[PDB]
């Protein structure tokens, strides 16, 4: 996958390719990639899918009861700290990485998690197989931005790594986190467009059934 | 290898208004096939099934764990559960043991309480896949997927579901060589289901 | 990495290069390696990325609550400390710290891998630190001035950059005294091109 | 420690009708994570025949300049059978038993009237089939030729299997072998194989 | 299989009328940039260049090979001879179990057919309009691939592949910014003296520190 | 040894190399035999050289099997033959292995022509001898057709419709242009073939002093007395 | 695969599986497991495919010109101690292949059991490959030497078709095959499906 | 040498089928973190140990 | 390791079991009693490592009691079976037990038959066959085996699953015990084969 | 593993071996013929890997007759046991075979009985037991056997021996053949134990 | 753990005796050259290659 992130001035841009692999075998597509965290705060990550959604989701929770304890969005920092103290004691055994982006009180914010806890505060990130196509891309264009152009030079990290990578395809994802609040463009484009192929019938007749037991919901 | 051990493989197929949840009955013990009548679909009711591949004793104790949530859960709302809960409490039950993971991909299918079809599958740690178009695991999973890929189109009639289902299981299961030869698909509606077992190629 | 110490004749001047890499490949060359444990006190982290990192966020309130219940400057000396019996009593996490800063006089404290803590009057680290023994050896002189312990970090640095693959990028520079902490950059359009 | 071999296979299937052989392979040159090129040709022709390769590109080049170097030796005096020239790659392949072409040969053509399609192990056993498939996408696209053109668990009236109809199933298995599988290509390279002849054309595939 | 000397990767591309070989002269044993003037394009003849990557002593054992039989022969060879010169030499190294822990990118103008062709340790080879070596397959060619070098003059490509060199310097360890371009077009063939690509850093600062 | 290999070797101010032209004329001194190819048959008569009647008739046999639907007769000295037939049969088993099929003849005599004169080389397994083959063979086989080969020692061979080879080749080969029409049946062609061997073999001809091999697309038959019988009464 | 050969009063029965796998992808189903050197000598493969084709078909060309060589058909042990010494020769360099070199030496028929080890055993009733343990357990129960000429068949097609429905790595057609003194003959192609 | 080609087939287990399959050359839904081939995090950039000597530990 | 084949008809169960006891070189017994009769209406055998073996059957047979006597539980073999199966699981993942068992008896819904491996993987089937009779017997089993078999037709064919063994199976076996458990309650028979 | 089991006595020399053929799960045979008559004097055994040991016995028989016709060379048991030792030992550095012998026979200084192990190390005994009889038939051996024992008694001794095998033994034996070389020539006994 | 103290004297072996034998915690006549545990000769004494990558040899 290519997950990848983008700071501009005032917001993140956090953007990700629709596709999950489990060998050389396409497992799910217009996969969504992007977690909820806080209205403020999303992230995205990369490795064990199972990791990445309850890494994020116990950020969710710490982060949901801060905020409603004390009546104060959290801040991004809380958010990485949370998943740092949580991935550092199993050693990365629980394999997480991740790009959280979100925009507190404090500014905007974009950080790069790794699975053994370690995080860095980014102006623009890649990860995922396609990191080296995408960062590729934001080597080259980034620069001071609004999020016009963070949202085309991030879309077109994504693209190259879709591109050339073999484990990165299908759409992509967007999600914009500025000091108006957060908006999401799920499926943003279609770069991996499939053929039109037609329909195909069995005869129903080509199946025999041995025996049939019918049971009714009640 | 304690999966290729017993071998068996699932596969859901959502239609219009329906879903085909089929599997195969071949119990394994490595090359040999202990029993031919090993059903690994289980169902807590006629609108909310499961299926299991990997390690049998897992799929079990985690069917036995699955309904005492479910009946508890039930007692606690009255309210039936959906299948997207039972997916996500699952994927909760699998990844409370992260240190030491059930050797097992589970299936879920069923009708949701507005009556449309579901189904999703997990890994052994809960990592979930809510499906539209279908979703298979087990020894034939590779087989499954790439003929349903072929053959699945969307919005199925109940008959032409299962029909299509069962052509791309009979067919992923003659290149498996765990692949069992007695097969039982339910085809779930919201009237309930219908458990309809074939038989391929007896080998 | 290449992280670097001087005490100079006001103040501690820390420099240090921005790349972090993974394997051939720079995962990011931005990366900030001068660490704040406090206002007077900063950390530059050598060692796994996130144990060095796990470290210096309990170094920071240890030594905040200590300054608080004694009612006086954090103690660049107690962080030191309270870094040593972490990376004492954890042998599996691989760390080693640069604590430097300033509550009455400067003090450079490195601790090693093991947690083998020596006060310093100049110290180097990382990976490309290996590569500048004999430069520093020759040319650091007791008691510089800014401009010339600057010109020594700057010369320093720059020569472990264009040695060690694991060291490159510009390279960071922050000078605390008594006055407070500024932060420098000399960037690598500079050191690159020469 | 050192890994002799590089998996760059994509997909080749062939499949031999009552007087026509219809090969098709896709493009894709595949490197780990990556792709090297989409424009190589997987498909080599000896004569009337074609000779199909996956696995690792070097491997399958250089059996098949073995294969060219041992078909002109031996065409001193008269063409070829398809059955010699399958029987010649099997004996060329084991002779490197010990340090396997990592590449699954299909090799078909026609001898005389009758149609022959050969699939090769990496070691060399050669069987006659009616329809094979190579590479990492052998198991997305088989069970559909098992299907809908060997009608194998068809228990009924069987449509009948005309040289479109399969080239049809041709497109869509390859569609959903690249829709499922990572490293089969952007586009498919079919062979037509009649009795008098034979033709190439070219589709697309999606290029992710 | 040496590892010892390293060189980085090798960027090719083909522009309307010719084709582009970019290599840097660093040359790195483990982390240490122990050379800083290895050079790696070599001419093998005219309309034709050749720039490896890998192990150093398995360059210059190529090279050393490749010379030997061109003065041996007294036939000519176009692009298209030398890249499969070079491919037999080895694929037969890797199949004796003796491999060059070498990448090799030969690149040549015939009478009117461009030559970009890759070949890797494995005697594995591809010919394609960009062709990238190393790291460089994996962060330089995802970048030049989304402009259409087809149509690009000498000028424009030169200055693309430097941008694409630049990225390796930013984004590889084992990548310097001294690097040496050849060119191949109908009637000519140059490799440059090496020289420096210039760098930029200033997103790197944070908020106040003093540009000394 | 260098002086025997270039003793060997050595051209005649004529050309042709002394131990061909040597083995030329040692060819000759052998039995006769008449090879005969039609349409549809191939047949080959050899008269056996029985030295002695108490020598077994059946064991001094004179046709050799190289390979199905491959015979093999042969004039002159009769030692070299067993290794010129055990190499053939090892030549036909090759490429059998390689090719799965039985091989074209005109394959197997180009194969036995490279290795006759290579008798210069040291390995031993692509060459016949360390000297030409005293021998003159008559190479019968079918691939897809009758075919009738002729080895000679200078390493040469022709395909043939009619040839004869040992001491009565010539007269034989003077007959043929008056016995010989390739459009008769194979048993009349066969009492032909029987009456010119009579024609110039030393004693009376009979079903015990002579050897037919006739190979065609049914069969690769060998005839026994009773049959040889049966034609020549 | 299993593979089953024995020997009873009226002859020998032949019996094989017909199937072929890579692990859990079944490559082939048609597979031919038997060797037919000539019409009184045949063996029958198991283990890996190419290596018990290749020294087989190797050994029948060793079978072929030594009837050219003695103008007499070979015996049964010479072609599998031909066999047996080609694979004996790459002991314990990993070579998987057992098979059963059966024929008739004029009036006696012999069954060989070959494998990679250098084994070599003759024997009146051998069973070969995976599917060989279930063979095995339903022909202990009712092989006889004495069995009639059907009854031996039906007990090999029998035994077979048992092992494949029980067996992973087996399971295609049943070849089935009938060796007499007059030599072999192929009985059919029975498809498991449809007994 | 042989690679055990067909051991599983060949023998009842008491996967080496009969066909070479291309593996010889986990149910966990797990992506890559970067293409690299087993690196998921920063490189521990420190001084390594070298020399001295491990063999005699304790003769300081 | 240590076979076991059982049967169930229409209105019994038989389980067969190798009585002999062994290590790897030597037989330690010949005649070792490897079954549990719960009520005289749930037969259960144990096999595996016997140190393992007899101490998870025992805390079985002990546990069935309690239940049965305390919290008027129903014996039946699903639930011997459901015990057997969560004892085996608990230990799995941590300290595991090697060894399985064969559990039948006569229920309400008439005989059950179930077998529960060393993972703690439960199946009932209409027969068993564990240790090496899984390799063995399974094809006398299809070719005897009917719905209708009568119990001294079970009998002759444990009988001849257990020949299987003996004449071809190199590990070797003297003695058999089969336990039939019927309405009628259980019956021993003891066999030298 | 394989068993076999010989004794000397006076002007008489028993060799019994196992005449099953068997592997780790599975017995291909159980009646093979495992003994070498090179002279009716002369009886040897062969034992262990059937590939390397038939071939290893085949390789000698045959050059025991050929240095018997060529060089004249007396067969003994100790000609036959030096022969078998030297086969061995030469391979045993670079392509050892795992097999193992047991050479027995009259030569003009009475009955001889030789071993040939694993490594090729030679010797002479009064009795020997190899296989599994090297831990089990030594106390019958050693309680049973006396110097005036008489042929048949050597035969019920080698009985016992192979009883205590068939007893104790986890691996079945059924079959054993035992062959008595004497001044009256070879006599060959089949016994199913 | 228990260091199978007695194996040797409980089973017949188809060295642990009874007892715990000293140094539980070749027939050549070798001694030592060095006082030092494994040194036979001067140690290699050069720049020893550390970093770069191991598990990504070919992407240079």
Known sequence: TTIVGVKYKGGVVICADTRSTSGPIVADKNCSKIHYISDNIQACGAGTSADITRVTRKASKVLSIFSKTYNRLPR??????????????????????????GVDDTGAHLYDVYPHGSSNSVSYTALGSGSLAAISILEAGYKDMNREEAMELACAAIEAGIMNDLYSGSNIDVCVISQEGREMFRNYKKVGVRNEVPKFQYPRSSVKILKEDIYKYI | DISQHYGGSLLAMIGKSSVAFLSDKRLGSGPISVSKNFTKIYSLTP?????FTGLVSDGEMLFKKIRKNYNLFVQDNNKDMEPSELSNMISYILYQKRLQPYYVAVIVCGMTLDKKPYASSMDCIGAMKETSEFVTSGTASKNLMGLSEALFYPEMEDEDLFTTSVQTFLNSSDRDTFGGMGFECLLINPEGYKRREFVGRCD | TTIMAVKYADGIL?????????????????????????????????????????????????????????????????????????????????????????????????ISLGGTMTEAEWQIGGSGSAYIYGLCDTTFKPNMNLEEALEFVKLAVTCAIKRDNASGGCIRMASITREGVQRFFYSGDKILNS | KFNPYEDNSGSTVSIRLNNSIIIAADTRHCSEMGIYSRNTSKIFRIGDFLLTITGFYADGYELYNRLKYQVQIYESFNKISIHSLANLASKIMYSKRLFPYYSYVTLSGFEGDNPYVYSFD????????????????????????????????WAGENYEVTEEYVKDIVRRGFNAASERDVKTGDNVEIWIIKKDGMTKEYERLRQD | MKNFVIGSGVISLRYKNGVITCTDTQASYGNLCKFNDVRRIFRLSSNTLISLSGEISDIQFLMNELNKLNESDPVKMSPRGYLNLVQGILYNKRSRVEPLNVSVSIVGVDD?????????????????????????????????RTCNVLDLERDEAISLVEKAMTVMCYRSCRSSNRIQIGVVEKGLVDISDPYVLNTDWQVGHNEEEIVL | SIVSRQNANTYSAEGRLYQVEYAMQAMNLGTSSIGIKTKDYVLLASEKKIISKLQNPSSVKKHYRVYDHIALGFSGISADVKTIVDKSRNFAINHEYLYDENCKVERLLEHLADLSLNFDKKEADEKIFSRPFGASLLIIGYDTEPRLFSLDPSGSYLEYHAKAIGSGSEVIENMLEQEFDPNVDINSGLKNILNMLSKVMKDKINNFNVEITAITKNECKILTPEEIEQFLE | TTTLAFIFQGGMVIAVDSRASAGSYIASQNVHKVI?????????????????????????????????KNNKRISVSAASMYLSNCVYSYKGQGLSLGSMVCGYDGDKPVI???????????????????????AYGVLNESYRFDLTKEEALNLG??????????????????????????????????????? | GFGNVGEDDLHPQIKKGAIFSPEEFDGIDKTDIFPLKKKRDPDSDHFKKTGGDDDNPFLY | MESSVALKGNDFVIIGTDSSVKNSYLVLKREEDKFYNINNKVVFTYLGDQGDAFRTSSFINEKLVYEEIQNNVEITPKVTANVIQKTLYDNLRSHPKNCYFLVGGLSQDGPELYSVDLYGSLHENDFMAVGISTYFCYGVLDKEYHKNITKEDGIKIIQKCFDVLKQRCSVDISNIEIKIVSKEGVETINKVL
């Open chain 3, 14 to 110: 820390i420099g240090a290069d921005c790349r972090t890499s993974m394997g051939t490949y720079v995962s990011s060359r931005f990366t900030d390696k001068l660490t704040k444990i406090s206002d007077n006190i900063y950390c530059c982290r050598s060692g796994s990325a996130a144990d060095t990192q796990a470290i210096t966020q309990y170094i920071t309130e240890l030594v905040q609550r200590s300054s608080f219940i004694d009612k006086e400057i954090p103690s660049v000396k107690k962080a030191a400390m309270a870094a040593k019996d972490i990376i004492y009593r954890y042998p599996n996490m691989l760390a080693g710290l640069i604590i430097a800063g300033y509550d009455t006089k400067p003090r450079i404290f490195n």
């Open chain 5, 112 to 144: 009117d057919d461009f030559l970009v062709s890759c070949v890797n340790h494995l005697g594995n080879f591809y010919e394609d309009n960009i062709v990238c070596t190393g790291l460089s397959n994996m962060i330089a060619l995802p970048f030049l």
């Open chain 7, 112 to 134: 060989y059991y070959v494998d990679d080890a250098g084994q070599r055993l003759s024997g009146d009733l051998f069973s070969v490959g995976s599917g060989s343990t279930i």
């Open chain 7, 157 to 195: 097609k029998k035994a077979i078709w048992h092992a494949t429905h029980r067996d992973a790595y087996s399971g295609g057609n049943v070849n089935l095959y009938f060796m007499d003194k007059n030599g072999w003959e192929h009985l059919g192609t029975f498809d498991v499906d449809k007994f």
């Open chain 7, 36 to 68: 037919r050197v000539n019409k009184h000598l045949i063996g029958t493969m198991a283990g890996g495919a190419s290596d018990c084709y290749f020294w087989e078909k190797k050994m029948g060309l060793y079978a072929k010109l030594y009837e050219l």
């Open chain 2, 47 to 51: 609108r909310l099934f499961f299926g």
């Open chain 4, 122 to 153: 990496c070691l060399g056993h050669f069987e006659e089939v009616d329809s094979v498939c190579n590479g990492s996408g052998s198991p997305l696209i088989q069970p559909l030729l098992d299907s809908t053109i060997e009608k194998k668990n």
């Open chain 1, 76 to 101: 991004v920092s809380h958010c990485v700290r949370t998943c740092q103290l949580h991935l550092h004691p199993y050693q990365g055994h629980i394999s997480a990485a991740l790009v959280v982006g």
